[PDB]
Design an enzyme around this catalytic site. Sequence first.
Site, mmCIF file in Angstrom:
data_model
loop_
_atom_site.group_PDB
_atom_site.id
_atom_site.type_symbol
_atom_site.label_atom_id
_atom_site.label_comp_id
_atom_site.label_asym_id
_atom_site.label_seq_id
_atom_site.Cartn_x
_atom_site.Cartn_y
_atom_site.Cartn_z
ATOM 1 N N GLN C 11 0.878 -1.199 0.000
ATOM 2 C CA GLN C 11 0.000 0.000 0.000
ATOM 3 C C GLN C 11 0.902 1.231 0.000
ATOM 4 O O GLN C 11 0.631 2.168 -0.776
ATOM 5 C CB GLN C 11 -0.926 -0.020 1.214
ATOM 6 C CG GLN C 11 -1.027 1.300 1.968
ATOM 7 C CD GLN C 11 -2.385 1.507 2.602
ATOM 8 O OE1 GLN C 11 -2.920 0.622 3.277
ATOM 9 N NE2 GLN C 11 -2.958 2.680 2.380
ATOM 10 N N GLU C 247 25.111 5.468 -11.739
ATOM 11 C CA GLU C 247 26.108 6.285 -10.999
ATOM 12 C C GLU C 247 25.721 6.375 -9.516
ATOM 13 O O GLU C 247 26.599 6.115 -8.672
ATOM 14 C CB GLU C 247 26.196 7.690 -11.587
ATOM 15 C CG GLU C 247 26.554 7.707 -13.070
ATOM 16 C CD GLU C 247 27.607 8.739 -13.430
ATOM 17 O OE1 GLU C 247 27.429 9.918 -13.055
ATOM 18 O OE2 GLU C 247 28.604 8.366 -14.083
HETATM 19 N N1 GTP Z 1 2.122 8.697 0.669
HETATM 20 C C1 GTP Z 1 1.554 7.704 1.402
HETATM 21 N N2 GTP Z 1 2.282 6.875 2.269
HETATM 22 C C2 GTP Z 1 1.652 5.871 2.963
HETATM 23 C C3 GTP Z 1 0.285 5.695 2.753
HETATM 24 N N3 GTP Z 1 -0.159 4.684 3.516
HETATM 25 C C4 GTP Z 1 0.876 4.181 4.200
HETATM 26 N N4 GTP Z 1 2.002 4.889 3.892
HETATM 27 C C5 GTP Z 1 3.281 4.526 4.521
HETATM 28 O O1 GTP Z 1 3.311 3.115 4.615
HETATM 29 C C6 GTP Z 1 3.593 2.661 5.923
HETATM 30 C C7 GTP Z 1 2.894 1.343 6.234
HETATM 31 O O2 GTP Z 1 2.878 0.515 5.092
HETATM 32 P P1 GTP Z 1 2.543 -1.052 5.244
HETATM 33 O O3 GTP Z 1 2.385 -1.421 6.698
HETATM 34 O O4 GTP Z 1 3.699 -1.780 4.605
HETATM 35 O O5 GTP Z 1 1.172 -1.367 4.449
HETATM 36 P P2 GTP Z 1 0.738 -2.879 4.041
HETATM 37 O O6 GTP Z 1 1.926 -3.789 3.848
HETATM 38 O O7 GTP Z 1 -0.064 -2.860 2.763
HETATM 39 O O8 GTP Z 1 -0.184 -3.440 5.251
HETATM 40 P P3 GTP Z 1 -1.802 -3.390 5.199
HETATM 41 O O9 GTP Z 1 -2.269 -2.018 4.792
HETATM 42 O O10 GTP Z 1 -2.431 -3.719 6.557
HETATM 43 O O11 GTP Z 1 -2.234 -4.384 4.139
HETATM 44 C C8 GTP Z 1 3.126 3.768 6.833
HETATM 45 O O12 GTP Z 1 3.955 3.829 7.966
HETATM 46 C C9 GTP Z 1 3.290 5.000 5.967
HETATM 47 O O13 GTP Z 1 4.544 5.559 6.235
HETATM 48 C C10 GTP Z 1 -0.427 6.507 1.894
HETATM 49 O O14 GTP Z 1 -1.631 6.344 1.761
HETATM 50 N N5 GTP Z 1 0.213 7.494 1.197
#
Ligand code: GTP
EC number: 3.6.5.-
Lengths: 118, 434, 433, 51, 428
Positions: C11, C247
Site C-alpha cells: 500500500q 552512478e
Molecule cells: N504517501 C503515502 N504513504 C503511505 C500511505 N499509507 C501508508 N504509507 C506509509 O506506509 C507505511 C505502512 O505501510 P505497510 O504497513 O507496509 O502497508 P501494508 O503492507 O499494505 O499493510 P496493510 O495495509 O495492513 O495491508 C506507513 O507507515 C506510511 O509511512 C499513503 O496512503 N500514502
Amino acid sequence: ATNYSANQYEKAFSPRYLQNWSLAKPTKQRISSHEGYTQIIANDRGHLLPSVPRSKASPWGSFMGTWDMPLKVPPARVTLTSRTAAGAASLTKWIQKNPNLLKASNGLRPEILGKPHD
Amino acid sequence: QRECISVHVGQAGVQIGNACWELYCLEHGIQPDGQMPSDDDSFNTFFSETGAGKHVPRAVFVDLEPTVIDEVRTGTYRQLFHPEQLITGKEDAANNYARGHYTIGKELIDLVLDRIRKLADQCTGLQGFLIFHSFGGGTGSGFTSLLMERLSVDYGKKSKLEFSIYPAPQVSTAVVEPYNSILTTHTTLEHSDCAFMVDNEAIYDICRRNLDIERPTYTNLNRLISQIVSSITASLRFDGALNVDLTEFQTNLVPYPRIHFPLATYAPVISAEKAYHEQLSVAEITNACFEPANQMVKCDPRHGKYMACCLLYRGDVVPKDVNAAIAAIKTKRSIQFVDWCPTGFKVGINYQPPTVVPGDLAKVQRAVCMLSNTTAIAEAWARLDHKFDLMYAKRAFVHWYVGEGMEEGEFSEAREDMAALEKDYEEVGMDSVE
Amino acid sequence: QRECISVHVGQAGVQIGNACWELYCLEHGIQPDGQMPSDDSFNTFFSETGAGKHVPRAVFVDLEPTVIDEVRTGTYRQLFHPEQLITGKEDAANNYARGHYTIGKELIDLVLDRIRKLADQCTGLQGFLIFHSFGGGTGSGFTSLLMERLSVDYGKKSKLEFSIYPAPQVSTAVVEPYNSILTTHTTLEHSDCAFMVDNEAIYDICRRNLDIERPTYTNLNRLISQIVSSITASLRFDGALNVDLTEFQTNLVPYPRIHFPLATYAPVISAEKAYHEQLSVAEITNACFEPANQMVKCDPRHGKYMACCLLYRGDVVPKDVNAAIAAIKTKRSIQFVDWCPTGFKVGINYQPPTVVPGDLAKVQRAVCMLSNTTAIAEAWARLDHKFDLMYAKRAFVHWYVGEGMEEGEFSEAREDMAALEKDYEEVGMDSVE
Amino acid sequence: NFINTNAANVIMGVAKKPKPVYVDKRTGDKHDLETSGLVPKYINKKDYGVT
Amino acid sequence: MREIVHLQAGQCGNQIGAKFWEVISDEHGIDPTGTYHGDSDLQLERINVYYNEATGGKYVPRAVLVDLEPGTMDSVRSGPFGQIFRPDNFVFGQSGAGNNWAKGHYTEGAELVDSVLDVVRKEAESCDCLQGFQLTHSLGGGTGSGMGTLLISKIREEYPDRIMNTFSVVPSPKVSDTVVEPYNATLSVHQLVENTDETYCIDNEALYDICFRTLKLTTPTYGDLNHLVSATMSGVTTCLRFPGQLNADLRKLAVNMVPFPRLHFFMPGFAPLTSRGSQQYRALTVPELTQQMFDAKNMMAACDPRHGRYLTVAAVFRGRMSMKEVDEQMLNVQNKNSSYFVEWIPNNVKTAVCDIPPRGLKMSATFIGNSTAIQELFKRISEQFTAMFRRKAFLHWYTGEGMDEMEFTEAESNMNDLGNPVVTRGAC
Ligand SMILES: Nc1nc2c(ncn2[C@@H]2O[C@H](COP(=O)(O)OP(=O)(O)OP(=O)(O)O)[C@@H](O)[C@H]2O)c(=O)[nH]1
Ligand SMILES: Nc1nc2c(ncn2[C@@H]2O[C@H](COP(=O)(O)OP(=O)(O)OP(=O)(O)O)[C@@H](O)[C@H]2O)c(=O)[nH]1
Ligand SMILES: Nc1nc2c(ncn2[C@@H]2O[C@H](COP(=O)(O)OP(=O)(O)O)[C@@H](O)[C@H]2O)c(=O)[nH]1
C-alpha cells in the site's frame, strides 16, 4: 574530506571570502609526496586489520551540542595584558578546566596571547 | 560589504527594534512591504534584496514569551520581517536570569544561532553583531548571556556590541532586577566587546525638559535610542568626511580588558518651539553632549574622570568647527580626563542629516552622539551592589534561581567579580604621581 | 534507450506511485487517459503503444485488493495496462512470513512475468526503481522475495530501493521492529542503493517549512515523488552534468553492506514564505545539510558523512554550485570520514521542478542530496534494541513460525544486524599513522 | 530562626540537572530530546557490534 | 623616461590621492572619461610619469588603491573622477582594521599585501625607467599606517634603489582623531625612519590655520584641505613633468635636503595663497613669493620653524620668472635671518624654476623644509606615547593581535634616537 589548497587561487577559497563567518576548518598548505605502493589497512567489509594500532578518539565526531557544553563558557579571546596575576590565573585555569570545549568540532578555539605583569 | 546582523532580545529589544527598523526603513525608502518605491545598494547594511524587489530586514527578534513579537507579526511591518527571523517561544522567563541562561532559554538558543548563521552566510562582509537587551529581565539578561557565550564559541573574536537598558538609579520596574543585572554583567564581562548603556530615568527627563513631552512612554524613549543606532551605523550607510566603522568603537573606547561599558548621549534633541530660537552650531551641539544633564545614563559625569570619548557628527558639520569645539571642551577644567589618555576625543563627520520620523524631535541640519567611558559609571555599579547585597544578605529571592539551575554559589562568584570591577575603576582612575 | 521500470510494492508503494506518476504524466504532458495532447522523453518511464497511448513502465503489486482496486477506478484508470496492476486476495497481515513464504509465493510468478514483458520492450534499461515500506508484510516480505529473484534474473541491472524506514518515535505497527530486521537481512546482499525517507521527518519538515500543522500521507508521497523525479531528470531532460541511475550507486555506497543512503530536498517553501526568500544555490545547498531539513529524523552533525551526492535541477550556474560545496567543505559543523577525501557528486540539470496542484511553490532552482551518513547507526541500534525487547520474550514469534520463517531466522537476522552496527562504527574510525 | 533556616536551605541545595527540551519552530513547539532521534542515546548500549 | 607609481592607503590616503588625481588631471588635460581635451602639446610630452596608455587615447592613472574596508574607495568611485582608475587596481579586502597598527601590519592586512604587491609589480614592470613610489597615508590610525608601512617595507626590499615619498598626515597637537594615535604614530614613524627616503609631514591643524588665516575660507571641507596637500604634490614632481631651467626631480631634491639618512622628515608649503579680500590687493612678484613662502604661517606641519634651525630648504617654482630675483631673494633671506639656518651648511637652500605654472596663476612656489622644529612633533608623540604606555593603556588589542612589549619599547627608543640628531644641530 581534507580541504586541500588551490595553490595560486586561494584568496577565493578562503573561508571568510566564501561567506563563512563561523570559525572554519583550516586548509592543508603543503602536500607531501610519498613513493611506492601503500599497503592495505582494512579488509573487504571495511574492518581494520588486527595488527594496526588504532586511534583513541570516538568513531563519531565530537559535536558537543547545547546541552552537553559546560556551563560558564570560557571566552574565545584572552590576552593577559594589564591584568593581575590572580586574574590571569583565574582565566587560564578556567580555559584549562574546560578541556572538552577545546577539543571539539563545534569547539571554542581560544586565542591565548599576552603576558601579565609578573 | 558592510552588513550588521542585529539580534533584538526581550520586550525592550523587540520594542526598541520596532523603533530602530522603522527609522532604518524611512531612511533608505524600503516601504512597510519591502518593495522600495524607486521606479541604491546602501540598504545592504541592514536589508537583503530577494530579487523580486523585496528588501528583508537582517535581524533576529527573539523572545521566550509571545505577545510582543506577535504584535509585530500582525501590524504595519508584518510583511517586512521574514517569519523565521521573528523567533518567539511559548513560556516566559519570570524576570529570572536563571530561566534565561539555563532552563526556558537553552531551548530557543539552537534555532536562534541557526537563523543567525543563515543571516551571516548571506553577508559579503559582516562588521559585527549589535545585540539589544535590558539588564533586568529573563530573556534580556538570560538569553543574551547564553547567546553571547555561544556566539563567541562560533564567531570567535568577531565584534559584538550590546546596546542595553541599564538598571535605573531610583525608578526600576522590578524587585529582582539587581540580581539579574549583576549575574548578566559577569557572564558578559569577558564575552562582550563594547556594551553601550542607556538608563531610562535619564531619557525620561531629557524628554520632559528638552523634547517638551510631559508624559513620555516607552515609545518616545525607544525612538530616541533608534537615532543613536543610526549615528553609530551612519558611516557604513551614507558618505561622510571621517568614516567610523563598528570595529573602531571597540579600539577607540574599551581601554583595559574588563572596562567595556560606554555611555550614550545625543545632541540637537530639541523640540520645534525651542528650535525657532537656536543656532544648533557644531560647538553648541558638542558642549551639550558633555553637559551633566543630557547624559542618557543618570551618572553625573562630574563625579568621575573621562577615559575615552568618541563623538559622531552626523549632518552639515564643517570639519574645522569640530576641531574647534573639542579644543574648547578640553580647556574647560570642569570636564576632566585621565592622564593615561592625552588624546581622548575621537571624531566621525558623516554627511546625511538626521532623519525625521513622522512623529517627534526637530529637523536638525546637524547632530552629534557621544559614547564616553567615564569612570563615573562606578557609582552605578556600587548602587547595583548595595542592592544585590541588601538582598543576598538574607539569600532573598534566591530560591527561584536555585529553582532553575543557578547553584547558590554562582550568586557569590558574580557579585565578587562585580567587586573586582569596582576596584578596577579605582585603579584606572588614580593618576600616576611619579 | 534510457528506460527505467518501477516496481511499486505494498500500500505504501502503491500510494507513493499515485503521486509519482501524476508528476511524471505532468512533466511529459501524458494526460490521465494516456494520450499526449499533440517529444520522445517519456520513453524513460512511458512506452508508446500503436494506438497513440503512452502506458507506464511500472508494476504496482499488493498482496491484497483495495489499495490497487482504487487505482483501477481512479482518475488514472486508462493509463495503467489492466495487467501491470497485480493484486492478491489476502493481505500478508503484517507478517514478513505471509509475504515471503505464504501469500506471496503465489504472486511472484505473475509479477516477474509482467516485469520481463516490460523489460523486453526496453532497449536499454538503466535499472529497477523499487518502493517499499520497511514495516508491513508485502513491504518487507514481498520486496525481499522480489529483490532475490530480480537478482537471479536481471543480474548487473541496478536495483534502487526507495523505502519508508521506521521512525524514531511514531509507528503504526507493533510487529514493525521484527519485519524490519528481517527484510534488511535478506535485502542487504541482493539490493543496491536503498534511499530511506522516514515519515516523522517529513511530518515535521511539513509543519516547519510549509506550515501544514496536520498533514496527510498525500502531502508526504508528493514530496517523495519530487525526490524520484530529481534522480531521473537526466535520464529524460537535458543537463550540464548528467548522472545515470548506475552512478548513484558507484559514487555513494562505500562498502557492500553500507548501502543505506539518506535523503533531503531544498526549496521546500510554501509560496508565501518563498516571497521573503532568495532561494539562491547557496541558500538551497546549505539547507540540504541543515539537520532540520533532513528526511530521516537524525542529526548528521552527531555523525560522519561518507559520500553525499548533490543533484541540482533548474537554473544552477556552475560556479554557484562550486562556491556552495566549497563553503560546506569549510564549515566545522559538517565533518567527513578519513577514507573519503573527495566526497561530493554534482549533477546539474536544467528542467525547473514541476508544480503538481498541491503545496510547494514554483521555484527556479532546487537540489536533492543523498548522503551516506554514519549517523544512521542510531537507527539500526534503536531498531535492533526493539527487536530484542521482543525476540527475548519470544513475542509474536508464533505468527511467523506458523507461516514459515523457521524461528532460527530471527536469530541469524539479529546477528547480521549486529554486524551492521560494527561496520558503521569501524568504517568511521581513524589511524594514528 | 527563619532567616538562618532559609539561608541554609538555599546554601545546601543542588539544583536540577534540568530535562533537555528543544524548540524547532518559530512558534515555540517543544520536543523532548532523548526520545527524539536527534541525540546519541542508543549508540552507547551494551550489545553494540556484539550478539 | 621616468615613472612614479602612486600608492594611496587608508581613508585619508584615498581621499588625498583622489583630490591629487583631480588636480593633475586638470593640469594635464584628462577629462573624467579619460581622454585628452587640452590646448598645449606640452601636456602629452611628459604624461608617461603618472598615466599609462590604453586603447583609443585612454590615459589611466598608475595608482594602487589600498584599504582593508572597501567603503572610502566607493565614494572615490562615485566622485567626479571615478571612472579613470583601473578596476584591477582597486585592491580591497572585506575586513575592518579598527585603527590598529597591529591589525594593519601583523594580521588581516597581511592577507591583502599579496594582491597589492601583485598590482604594484604589474605597474612597476609596465615602465621603461621607474624612479620610485609615492604613498599617501595618515600616521594617526590604522590601514594607512600599518598596511602602508607593510607595503613600504615590502616595496623597499623588492626595489632598494628607488625614491620613496611618503605623504603622511601626522597626529595633531591640539585635538585628536583616533584614541591610539600615539601608538600608531610611534610604530609607523619607527617603520618610516629606516625605510623611506622622503617623508612629507602634513598636519591638519596647520591646514586649518592656512585655510582660515590665509585663504579666509568660511566653510573649509576635507576637499579643500586635501587640495593644498595635492598642490604640494603637484609642485614637487614638476621638473620631470614640464620643461624649465634648473630642473630638480625627486632624487635631486632628496640629495639636496637630506644631509644624513635619518633626517628625511620634511615640512611642505605652497605659497600663491591669498584671501578673497586680498587677491586684488596683491602685488605679484618673486620677492612676495619668497616672503609668503618662508613665513611661519603657510607651514603645513604644526611645527614652528622659528623655534629651531633650518637644516635644508627647497623651493620649486612654477612660472616664467627671472633668475636674478629668485637667486637674490634666496640669498637675501639667508643673509637676513641668520640664526634660523645651520652655519655648517653654507647656502642651505636649493632652487628649481620650471616655466609652466598651474592653469590660473602666473607664478607658483612649493616649499620643502627639513628643519629642527620636527623635534616638537616627535617629542609630542613621545610624551603622549609615554603617558599612554606607562599604564599599559589601550595595549589590550595591540597584544591581542600578536605584538609584544618590546615592539613599543623599540619604537619609542628609535623615535627618541631620531629626536637626538634633530636637536644636536640646534647646538652644533
Ligand atoms: N504517501 C503515502 N504513504 C503511505 C500511505 N499509507 C501508508 N504509507 C506509509 O506506509 C507505511 C505502512 O505501510 P505497510 O504497513 O507496509 O502497508 P501494508 O503492507 O499494505 O499493510 P496493510 O495495509 O495492513 O495491508 C506507513 O507507515 C506510511 O509511512 C499513503 O496512503 N500514502
Ligand atoms: N524603550 C523600551 N524599554 C523597555 C521596554 N520594555 C522594558 N523596557 C526596559 O527594560 C526593562 C525590562 O525589560 P525586559 O528585560 O526586556 O523584559 P523581558 O526580558 O522581556 O521580561 P518580561 O517581559 O517581564 O517577561 C524595564 O525595566 C524597562 O526599563 C520597552 O518596551 N521599550
Ligand atoms: N587632508 C585630508 N586629511 C584627511 C581626509 N580624510 C581624513 N583625513 C585624516 O585622516 C585621519 C584618520 O584617518 P585614518 O584613521 O588613518 O583612516 P584609516 O586609514 O581608514 O584607518 C584623520 O586624522 C584626518 O585628519 C581628507 O579628505 N583630507
